[PDB]
Amino acid sequence: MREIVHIQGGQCGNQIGAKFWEVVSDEHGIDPTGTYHGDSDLQLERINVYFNEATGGRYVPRAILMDLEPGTMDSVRSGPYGQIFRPDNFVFGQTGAGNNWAKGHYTEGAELIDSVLDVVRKEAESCDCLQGFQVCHSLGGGTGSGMGTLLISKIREEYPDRMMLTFSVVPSPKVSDTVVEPYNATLSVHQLVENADECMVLDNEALYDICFRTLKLTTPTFGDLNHLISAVMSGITCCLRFPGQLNADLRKLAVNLIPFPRLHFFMVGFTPLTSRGSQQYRALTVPELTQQMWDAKNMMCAADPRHGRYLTASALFRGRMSTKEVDEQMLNVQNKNSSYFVEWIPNNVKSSVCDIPPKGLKMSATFIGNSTAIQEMFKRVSEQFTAMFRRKAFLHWYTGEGMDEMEFTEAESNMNDLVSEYQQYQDASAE
Template sequence: MSLIWLQVGQCGNQIGQEWWQILSSNVTDADRYPYFSRDGLINSICVDTEPKVIRKLRQQVKRGYFRDGNIIVGQRGRGNNWAYGYQGISSSAEQSLLDRTMEAFRKEVERRDCYSGTVILHSLCGGTGSGLGSRLCEEIREAYPAGYILSVTAAPHETGDSPLQHYNSLLCLAWMQRFCDGILLFQNDEVMKRATSLVEKKTFTASGLQPSVSLTSMNTHIASCLVGLFCPVYSLRTRSSVSVGLEPWELIRCLCPMSTMKFLHTSVVCSRGAASWDKVTSSVVQTIPRANPRGQLHHSLSVLAVARNSQDYPFLLSRDAVLMKLRQAYRCVSWNPSPIHCWTDPQNILDPSCQSHSLTVCANHSSAADLMSGVLSKARAMYDAGAYLHWYRRFGCEDHHFQMSFDTLDSVVEEYRGLGVP
């Protein structure tokens, strides 16, 4: 009972909805305690500046209940503005969402036998997810410095979700780099591509038109990646076969040994029937970004593979071949003595109704620099032109905040681009 789940903004709560639906329906009673309190309530704080999404969340998650005091909602949005979300509303008409959230967080910490960390779900684009999410990470780090913070972050479409998305992404990424121990980064364009391929496998269209992909399908894919990584695995249970929720913190320990590089790329493949592990591994490998726009090959600092199967013996026979294939495909750096890790569990929670197996691979991968480079170039062009800056200055975001963020992401990009250099 050491984890606290924190869902911030529309995107964070929609991903959380899919996560809790999968988890509450499939996790066994013995493994509930990292995610549910002893009184049966879900270990999550849900925060948004508008009530609509959280209202739907509470209706959709049928086999679990959220604590009333952990539902923190406002009555007006944050205008897709990081500074507005970070600073909040200075009005007596609406009590600070930050204060209410931190009070709920304190009470959740006191319910724990031993608080070890927080998983925060949010986006880079919206004002609440990016701005309030950044502020909460900062406040939690200051109040509970010994606990881990793992961010699950959704990046906007490259073509544009909002005219302010580049500023919001710049500032939020810089805050995540400063205050989080690890960042699971999901790019909407890549998530849509993956969700589309899954829909195509399940749907036949006589017209040959590409089937449409809903936002729910994209959120379900992200939630499936989280389930593959965070659901209890046999490898991390106690001797009495009890899960204490070590998975997020062991993931950080395995994949983020250097504080300058902590952005993680995740892929998952789930297969029914008798498909070989080599075929499943090949499907995962196909999702890896190969090179940046300049043609430079990507590399990985470290890789974690999580294999779930109704019978783990076949995987154990293939384990060495699978890990070698992943090590080569992800181009693990030669100077890391232990670049690849493996967890196994004899149950596939992603598809427990039949014989199936899944492979979830998470890597500290240099493709994160591509996203940050794009954000830097577009945000710089806007900043140099003075575009929209008055919207941020209005809420106390000044030039030094932007300059610090530019410098932070520049250094991260430089670190990742140096991964493959001998």
């Protein structure tokens, strides 16, 4: 009865949202036609968190699909679970943003943002109680980044107290997809710092590394990456949807994770990710899950936690497990890696336990780390942004959309100040 409004933005955001909604429909026993077919009352316990009931048994997602081009959500509708979504929640423009944050935020986003907010308000008013909004999108793309940040700002203005959760696909370090990725990421991070209460950083190259090393897949499409992302997005809110021995909502995670308002960027990891070959060979135990959680390779963010220091870290476990085992395992992890944990916080771990594991898994766990390692991710993006901005490469595309040059400088200054926050609390000593 604590409703969450899901928003998908851009091509990447829409694909991730489709994967996530298909995963959630599987987990709640919802067929692609919307009817419940689970044969388990636990599935319908808290289905209102994500779905609304139709005239019959049909359940419609509380999802809002965004784009400036219709092709991506045409593919979304053609997908296996494209018919669950209410057709009124598909908001499209006609000319897509040419990977232009300016086009997606000022020129072409302005017309569509009125409809987007109308749909968001219509979905939010139907909620009995609103936990908040979760927005899945990708930094480094025009419509995704620009429209998502604009909508996040508008929703922050309308509903200040409600939670804002973001799943941003930050551009990957080593391989860049589009040229203007540093521009879009730099402009979007500035908005997310001010508006988004909670943010999860995902990198496609990190996802490739984890799916090739842990899952040991050799030709992973974007479907696999969206699958891992969807697993994380499900596991973060499984405590709202199922009874837990020690339950913890999104606001509780935000309170226990965010020491200071600007330091709300997190790296996430999901366990247990097991290769098909070693599925039988692996032992499902709480120590094994914790060991896989705290591995740097398990992180879906490019930055590795070893370079930084863990400011905070939440662990949402799922399964019928010993709270003694869980607490002892993460206390032992803290004691062993105290060099990687911040000193001026006596306990850097927020343990949450849900009694209902994901389908097929005896036990599972999602890990959400607020660490100063993300500083190097921002530093790299700024290294690219400065190199392009010094010579104003591709700057005319943003300038002709009615954005001042000073906006880029302000965004970079804000992002560098955030880097300074992370470094200062990394090297900050108690007393």
